[PDB]
Design a protein around this ligand. Structure first.
Ligand SMILES: CC(C)(COP(=O)(O)OP(=O)(O)OC[C@H]1O[C@@H](n2cnc3c(N)ncnc32)[C@H](O)[C@@H]1OP(=O)(O)O)[C@@H](O)C(=O)NCCC(=O)NCCS
Ligand SMILES: CCCOP(=O)(O)OC[C@H]1O[C@@H](n2cnc3c(N)ncnc32)[C@H](O)[C@@H]1O
Length: 633
């Protein structure tokens, strides 16, 4: 079953099937003309001359786009929209409590970004300084990210659900000079500590770089205050001049770092530059969502994740959209919350995640009860695979069978959408990301690196660069080259597996490395094992993912205690809380399986394939039998 392109979409679409085909072929055959022309979606301070300048050569990866052009992201997201659209809403903010919302016009946002840019400059922040942002889903998170970009500071946004230890690791690695936070965030009626977590983070004796903490009063909770270091947001911004002249950034000036979990090691800072990234986010946002002036757009992703960077803030604002920032969760106070927000603000484009869809579907019709949903023209899904059944529930209940669903496959490392439908150009298959975006050349290779032709499956690689590609890993270009460009030479390895069907549509099966997907959150099995083994009573651990109906994968941890320690309710609780402390609640094992029987190769390497199979139900060979009975209990 292919879903046809509906007439209302065909009548209005920016790109039809023929235009998709033609532009696709040109992006591939002639990237310099294609991306040379498409780069004009942005305003450049000085024009680029060179367009594509890239190599995936082994141990010698170099990615540059538009390299001689200069520009300012904040000017593209704000300034250039003032003359025509200064009165238009830039951001609709919907509170965790429905009595709370705000409309923030382009003019108002610009003025606050200008005030906050001066605040930053007056505080001593300079172009290239890294600024850590640990904020909830409030408009001020946006102001802080845009102010940083405006001055050429390099923001590093840390998701609010990270623990103080996780916050400190990111601060240490990036040498962040400043932390921007709130006293607390508000989520599903609960107040979540943020500033306290920062206080704990800065007590780590390896944190040396942070000179100030800017705190937004979001809840007025009693916090500890260090005079001098700590500064209230309101105090600072109100003293700052609202006049700020944006300076030109080179196309290859660093824009942001985003810590991202890998197959091995601890999270690394995926680094995006300015020009290609922003051309790519604005271009993909515009065509995949079929954005028309006046469309109300809603991405539900947190600002702490890449989806929140590219498609909550940067892509939409570049295009002059009204973008909605929701503080809470789609099913609080009730499962109908998400659709209530859609009606309240007349959302035309809704972009969400399969975990949220599956949580709402588990509530059947309570998800749509009392709601109208008519304003909706376009639906999106990203972050994890969506089965045909969930896709169909989404298409029917939320979109009322009237809205194309754009299932967008991509990654932190890709900056923007990679394999995705375009709503007026491509016919949909439930559960398929479908076809590559402009400038994207995917392939499927076997474990030896041989391309597989026709209907097939294999390792999903991208065989050439695209403007939005991550340029490096902060402080570690060698690890960037190793992780992504060493498995299959001269190719970008995504670490995902995929099938290609008889039509040439891609079906992403999931990570083939040791990376988990837990409620749409990318986590490394290695880092969770490191966190566990750091516990004074734990000798060894092996972490796998198991299928879970809502979350996609749940975390299953095999744990070996040091001699002289026993399993108890207490130790169970302590070990789970230890992971919460090391990483955050998102990384907490759902199951602890206590064992002295980790399977290992003769060289001592833990073999996870079998652990994966046992946990799901599907040197010393005796360990498998012990493991089987332990699992059954
Ligand atoms: C958002 C949604 C997609 C799934 O939620 P989720 O991302 O998996 O996270 P949850 O809401 O379950 O919370 C898990 C933990 O992470 C924390 N967390 C999640 N987001 C956070 C954030 N933005 N900032 C700080 N902490 C956060 C929660 O507080 C909770 O921690 P705790 O139990 O130790 O106090 C959607 O299904 C939803 O609204 N969840 C309902 C709550 C729930 O029970 N979810 C589990 C599946 S039903
Ligand atoms: C939304 C982008 C999130 O970026 P992150 O870097 O956090 O996660 C990237 C990984 O999410 C999965 N993934 C993402 N989108 C899809 C998708 N649409 N279908 C299947 N899997 C997906 C793929 O496994 C991918 O390697």
């Amino acid at each position: 079953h292919k879903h046809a392109i509906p007439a209302n979409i065909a009548d209005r679409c920016l790109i039809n099937p023929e235009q998709y085909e033609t532009k696709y072929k040109q992006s591939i055959n002639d990237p310099d003309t294609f991306w040379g022309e498409q780069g004009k979606i942005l305003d450049w301070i000085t024009p680029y001359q060179k367009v594509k300048n890239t190599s995936f050569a082994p141990g010698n990866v170099s990615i540059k786009w538009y390299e001689d052009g200069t520009l300012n992201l904040a000017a593209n997201c704000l300034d250039r929209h003032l003359q025509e659209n200064g009165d238009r809403t830039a951001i609709i903010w919907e509170g965790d409590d429905t009595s709370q919302s705000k409309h923030i016009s382009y003019r108002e946002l610009h003025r606050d970004v200008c005030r906050f840019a001066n605040t930053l400059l007056d505080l001593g922040i300079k172009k290239g300084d890294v600024v850590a942002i640990y904020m909830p889903m409030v408009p001020e998170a946006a102001v802080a990210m845009l102010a940083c970009a405006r001055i050429g500071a390099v923001h590093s946004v840390i998701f609010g659900g990270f623990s103080p230890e996780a916050v400190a690791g990111r601060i240490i690695d990036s040498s962040s000079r400043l932390v921007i936070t709130a006293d607390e965030g508000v989520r599903a009626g609960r107040s979540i500590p943020l500033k306290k977590n920062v206080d704990d983070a800065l007590k780590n004796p390896n944190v040396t770089s942070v000179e100030h903490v800017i705190v937004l009063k979001r809840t007025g909770s009693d916090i500890d205050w260090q005079e001098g270091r700590d500064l209230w947001w309101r105090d600072l911004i109100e003293k700052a001049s609202p006049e700020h002249q944006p300076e030109a950034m080179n196309a290859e000036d660093p824009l942001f770092i985003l810590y991202t979990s890998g197959s091995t090691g601890k999270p690394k800072g995926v680094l995006h530059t300015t020009g290609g990234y922003l051309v790519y986010a604005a271009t993909t946002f515009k065509y995949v969502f079929d954005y028309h002036p006046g469309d109300i757009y809603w991405c539900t992703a947190d600002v702490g994740w890449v989806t929140g960077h590219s498609y909550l803030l940067y892509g939409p604002l570049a295009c002059g959209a009204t973008t909605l920032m929701f503080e809470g969760v789609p099913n609080w106070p009730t499962p109908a919350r998400m659709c209530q927000v859609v009606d309240k603000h007349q959302v035309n484009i809704l972009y969400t995640a399969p975990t949220a869809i599956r949580a709402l579907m588990a509530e059947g019709d309570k998800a749509i009860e009392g709601t109208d949903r008519s304003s909706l023209r376009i639906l999106g899904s990203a972050g994890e695979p969506i089965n045909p059944e969930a896709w169909e529930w989404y298409w029917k209940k939320i979109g009322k069978e009237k809205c194309p669903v754009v299932d967008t496959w991509w990654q932190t490392e890709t900056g923007g959408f990679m394999i995705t439908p375009l709503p007026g150009a491509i016919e949909l298959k439930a559960g398929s990301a479908t076809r590559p975006f402009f400038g994207v050349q995917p392939a499927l290779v076997d474990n030896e690196g041989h391309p597989q032709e026709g209907a097939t499956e294999g390792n999903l690689v991208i065989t050439d660069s695209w403007p939005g590609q991550a340029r490096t890993l902060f402080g570690d270009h060698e690890r960037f080259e190793q992780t992504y460009f060493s498995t299959f030479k001269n190719m970008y390895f995504s670490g995902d597996g995929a099938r290609r069907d008889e039509d040439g549509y891609y079906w992403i099966t999931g990570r083939v490395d040791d990376v988990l997907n837990v409620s749409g959150h990318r986590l490394g099995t290695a880092e969770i094992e490191s966190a566990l083994v750091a516990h004074p009573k734990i000798a060894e651990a092996a972490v796998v993912g198991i299928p879970h109906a809502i979350k996609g994968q749940a975390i299953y941890a095999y744990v070996t205690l040091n001699h002289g320690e026993e399993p108890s309710p207490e130790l169970y609780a302590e070990v789970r809380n230890w992971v919460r402390k090391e990483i955050g609640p998102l990384a907490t094992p759902d199951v602890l399986h206590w064992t002295d029987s980790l399977p290992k190769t003769r060289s001592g390497k833990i073999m996870r394939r079998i652990l994966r199979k046992i946990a799901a139900g599907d040197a010393d060979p005796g360990v498998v039998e012990k493991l089987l009975e332990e699992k059954q209990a």
